[PDB]
Amino acid sequence: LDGIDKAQEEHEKYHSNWRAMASDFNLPPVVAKEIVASCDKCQSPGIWQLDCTHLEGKVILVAVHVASGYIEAEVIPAETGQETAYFLLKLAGRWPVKTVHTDNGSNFTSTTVKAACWWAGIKQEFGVIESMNKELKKIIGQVRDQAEHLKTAVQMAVFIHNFKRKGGIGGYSAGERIVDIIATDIQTKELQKQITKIQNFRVYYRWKGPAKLLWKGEGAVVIQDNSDIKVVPRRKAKIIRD
Amino acid sequence: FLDGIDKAQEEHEKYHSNWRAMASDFNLPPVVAKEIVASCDKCQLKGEAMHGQVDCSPGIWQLDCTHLEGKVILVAVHVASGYIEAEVIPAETGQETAYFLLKLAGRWPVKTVHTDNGSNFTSTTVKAACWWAGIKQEFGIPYNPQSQGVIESMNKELKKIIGQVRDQAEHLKTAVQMAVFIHNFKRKGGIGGYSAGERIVDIIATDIQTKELQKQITKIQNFRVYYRKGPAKLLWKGEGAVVIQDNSDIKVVPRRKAKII
Amino acid sequence: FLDGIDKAQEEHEKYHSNWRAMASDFNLPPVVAKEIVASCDKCQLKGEAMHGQVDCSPGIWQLDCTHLEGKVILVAVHVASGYIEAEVIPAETGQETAYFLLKLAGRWPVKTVHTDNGSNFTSTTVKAACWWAGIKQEFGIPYNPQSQGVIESMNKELKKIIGQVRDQAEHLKTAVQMAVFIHNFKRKGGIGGYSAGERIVDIIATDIQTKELQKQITKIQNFRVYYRKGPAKLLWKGEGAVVIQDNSDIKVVPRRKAKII
Amino acid sequence: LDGIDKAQEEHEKYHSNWRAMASDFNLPPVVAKEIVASCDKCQSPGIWQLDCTHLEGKVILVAVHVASGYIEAEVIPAETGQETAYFLLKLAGRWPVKTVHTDNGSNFTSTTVKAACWWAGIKQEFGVIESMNKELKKIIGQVRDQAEHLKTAVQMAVFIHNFKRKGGIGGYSAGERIVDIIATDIQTKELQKQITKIQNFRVYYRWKGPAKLLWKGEGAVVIQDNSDIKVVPRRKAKIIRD
Amino acid sequence: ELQKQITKIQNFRVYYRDSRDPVWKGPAKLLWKGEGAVVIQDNSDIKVVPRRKAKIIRDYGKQMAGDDCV
Amino acid sequence: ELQKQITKIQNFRVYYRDSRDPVWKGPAKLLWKGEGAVVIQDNSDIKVVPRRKAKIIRDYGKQMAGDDCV
Amino acid sequence: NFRVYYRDSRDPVWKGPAKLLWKGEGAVVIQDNSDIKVVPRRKAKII
Amino acid sequence: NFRVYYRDSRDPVWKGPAKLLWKGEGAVVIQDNSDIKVVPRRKAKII
DNA sequence: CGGGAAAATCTCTAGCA
DNA sequence: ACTGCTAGAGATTTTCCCG
DNA sequence: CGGGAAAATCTCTAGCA
DNA sequence: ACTGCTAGAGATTTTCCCG
Ligand SMILES: C[C@@H]1CCO[C@H]2Cn3cc(C(=O)NCc4ccc(F)cc4F)c(=O)c(O)c3C(=O)N12
Ligand SMILES: C[C@@H]1CCO[C@H]2Cn3cc(C(=O)NCc4ccc(F)cc4F)c(=O)c(O)c3C(=O)N12
Ligand SMILES: [Mg+2]
Ligand SMILES: [Mg+2]
Ligand SMILES: [Mg+2]
Ligand SMILES: [Mg+2]
Ligand SMILES: [Zn+2]
Ligand SMILES: [Zn+2]
């Protein structure tokens, strides 16, 4: 508390995201989110791309996490709807898959894949994928000598790409990047859930009119009144539901 | 306490009386009666009543096979989080286990796998797979399923879920994947009120973040401490207590008798 | 709380999410999420975590068969005392069980016998034997060995003792009788620090003595009490508390609001 | 305490047993036992009788608890040492058998019976048994029509005799009598055990010479000094082992 | 007369259990013994325990110890 | 600089166990994380827990609840 | 009223709902499909 | 020294005495008849 | 500070076969 | 030298909320 | 009243198959 | 309308004993 004005000034002078203001000034994320949302002027993690490539006369189904570059690939006996549905069901069970982007191939348009997406609650919409396939083929060629079957080589290539290839802004691997992105998405979901929980109530302070509730503390209550954020003690404030 | 001891010893050799009976019937103190019982091999038939604790490090997975409708299901669980992976395999063999394990190692940072001594887990093929993927292999004490207690428990959980959703799928493999999904994302509880998926994400991200933060702190902060001996290395000072390390030994001491240089 | 409920119900029908997951993912209060879970038959797969308690009345014996070296051992235990009787029988049949039971009933006051639903215990011959000896028969819930816990435990104990003395006898029947002796007279502990034989003697003698004393007291003492309802019968008065019986119900009341006539 | 003189006077005027003095005047059994044993002028439970009877060309082994009249009878295939040894082992396992009296028959003198008596710690020494056999035959005849085999009739007769035949000083059954006798024997054994445990210590009170220890209570110590029993406060008494 | 019998009946020790706890409660004092209930005193507390949950003994070692004496 | 990183590393929560108790001890605070040991603070008590007995998370719900704030 | 779901006898499959006729210390008596059964409370859940 | 008696592996018969080479949190390493074995402390008794 | 509902923590079980 | 655990069903104990 | 050994009570497990 | 228990291995807590 007693830092909301500093947060507003810093937002005006930098237009920083709510995370920066919450961390630097040590404010609850709800308060910072309300502050950033108020200024009108200043106003992905679950998306995957599916494709089928061919190598050595065998079909490899490849899934790319667009935001991270994290790859999951499998050799499938045939390029059929059943195999794609099973692969997608596995992926959904192992990662929070929200949307899948395909290329209108018959297997992806099959009713089996539609059923799998419906049960898993996944949305389907018909150059990252091609470059990814190119790099996967490169790694498979590099490691083809250490294996005996194509599927083992494909899994080794997935391992190398996801955890042994480092490069980018911070020099992290795809696995670390996807873990970080999913963690951030969980943070965002929790923030939204608590905003939903809190926004259903109203606060009367000192008696003034109804005001939006933002945060409840041990001995302090942070509220918003006509685009103005204020701190009031609990004894002086009454919280109700309407 | 000599003739009583002799009579008690003969009585025990015949009947193996417990220490209370001998103490009562031969005017013996409890200590000597207990010594009589303890010196008899034939009366040592019970282990100490306790349980150990399995390793729960962020990099350990527990693997096991289970059976359902005449088919083999390979199951792995991330111990720290309870996050499971599973799949039907045609045969309970080392090749399928090694393929499963290479898949797992390419999708999560598997540092160690802990399993029972089933033939598939002890095969040379799985050993080669672990060697390639940089995975350490730990085997529990034979015929001690408690050593794999986590994954065994998950075998019970997965099967349960499989029974809840068996009518939504024609094939058992689809039901297995459905149950994996349900467990990893649709069941919340335990540490943090998380689901297993969010819990594993949090655990791995926390591992990376804390590693980086501690590395930066060590790079910036460097000091030596003398406490009630050698020049130990400080780790955290505050609240009137100082934590130091001296020859791979971490000790917490009060602020008194501790100088920081 | 009506929009979230429908989505939670659909999500549950597909996945059978537990109440925590639904409360988290659909902004639901715990009560409504729990109601969703409770209204689903497919999610009721666990009984309440507790144990009952077996009858321990002075007249109840628990009987069971056990197997050792391809031979059948019939075992009875006096529940209140832990006093056991046992013997090898050639066949696990109703005739031998009834002979054993008539023998037991002629040596101790067996009022009731509690057993599992093994065929020998449900035979008409054993029923006739119990009818002649004035013995009430109780059968546990089928395939619930816990209902016979005591005797089951004693089976384990008996076998253990047999293993300790099996080399002192040539025949298994002799070893069984040796183990019965050892348990009944050479093992002390439990209630009163007794052996099982001493404990059963004390239990039975106390039963007779207390019965006679209470009968004499009732013959000598007779009074009526009014508390708060009717002329209850006093049982024990003193220490600022009165115990009364009314309509076959026993009540303990403070000395206040209680008049003795 | 403060009743030793009354106990001594009661013993002098009646020479009653220690149980009566302990119960009437509420004294520890050790003190009453010491009092009764002091006067020189005033200075079985585990005994069994074995026999073999014959009926309908079958051998019935009968054991009688002499003190109580409680019977244990079985039909044995042959009057052999092995059968007798097994019967004796069972009896010893079920009751505290200390001694058995037999009629010098070959089975009772067999090495098998000697081994059984040695393992069970039973002592063998070679008009109650005959009368009990007659009563057993009478009961068997009374109930012979209710059974089909002789062994069942024998067990029914044992039941009737032990628990359904009442008669004597108090109209008690044989089972009740044996339970009472064995309970009294346990009482006696425990009294002897505590006397043995306590006799190994000496007491110095107020400092006088060593004195026999009889009872160590919570606030007093009852001792004996030259055929005189006295009570001493705990502080004024010291107990040692010689 | 009556007092002696009452004291004798109160010399007996009772070990019992509560409806939901498996461990046996220590040696309470016996006050009244009925067909299906036993009224006991356990540290100045008067409890009615069902017959099927009570083991009633006259611990003979304690009786010979004189612990029943004042 | 250093203070910010120390506060961040102290924002993490630790659930641990003792050598003989199977239940997991509640969310203690993290002070130091080593290769084989974690030094935590649990109600003004500083404990060294072996690595194999500690689960370290940044509980995101509580982080978004603002509980870390003074 | 009460709904009871129970594990019957050596059958790992849970059944119910069944009416709760009676509740004891360690067991219950229920009626499922016009059939009366006795189940340990360990093997039953009442709602 | 220590005498250890243990239940080895699916064999209900207790063995020993064996020398206690090492004692851990939930297991012990022992030597019986010149053979090294690893046993859970649940399945061992040390004297 | 006083009660009551709610939330949290505690106790205990089967099944993993 | 390695090691029972998991998640659900009730029970009981704090904790928050309006006077 | 102060410590230490002993006794008692408490906690927990396998096996009953 | 019926029902886990037993006995042993350590752990921990009272209780007694001499100053
Ligand atoms: C041939 C492989 C290798 C050698 O051992 C066997 C037998 N076995 C037995 C069980 C088992 O008895 N589970 C029940 C159980 C009991 C107690 C507990 F704490 C946990 C539990 F799971 C397994 O789970 C299991 O996987 C195996 C197995 O794989 N094998
Ligand atoms: C054919 C009869 C009639 C129908 O039931 C079967 C099977 N049964 C099984 C066990 C058993 O599983 N014991 C292990 C156990 C497990 C838990 C527990 F608390 C106590 C325990 F004894 C028995 O003891 C037993 O006697 C029988 C038996 O006799 N029968
Ligand atoms: Mg296995
Ligand atoms: Mg297994
Ligand atoms: Mg049976
Ligand atoms: Mg049985
Ligand atoms: Zn022995
Ligand atoms: Zn459901």
Numbering used by the authors:
A (entry chain K), D (entry chain B): 2 to 44, 57 to 139, 149 to 228, 235 to 270
B (entry chain I), C (entry chain A): 1 to 228, 236 to 268
E (entry chain C), F (entry chain L): 212 to 281
G (entry chain D), H (entry chain M): 222 to 268
Source paper text:
In the case of HIV-1 integration, the sites of strand transfer are separated by five nucleotides on each strand of target DNA, resulting in a five-base-pair duplication flanking the integrated provirus upon repair of the single-strand gaps by cellular enzymes. These reactions occur in the context of nucleoprotein complexes referred to as intasomes, which consist of a multimer of integrase (IN) bound to two vDNA ends. HIV-1 IN consists of three domains spanning 288 amino acids. Regardless, intasome function is provided by a conserved intasome core (CIC) structure composed of the catalytic IN subunits held together by a pair of synaptic IN C-terminal domains (CTDs). In the first step, 3′ end processing, two-nucleotides are removed from each 3′ end of the viral DNA (vDNA); in the second step, DNA strand transfer, a pair of phosphoryl transfer reactions covalently join these 3′ ends to the target DNA via a one-step transesterification reaction.
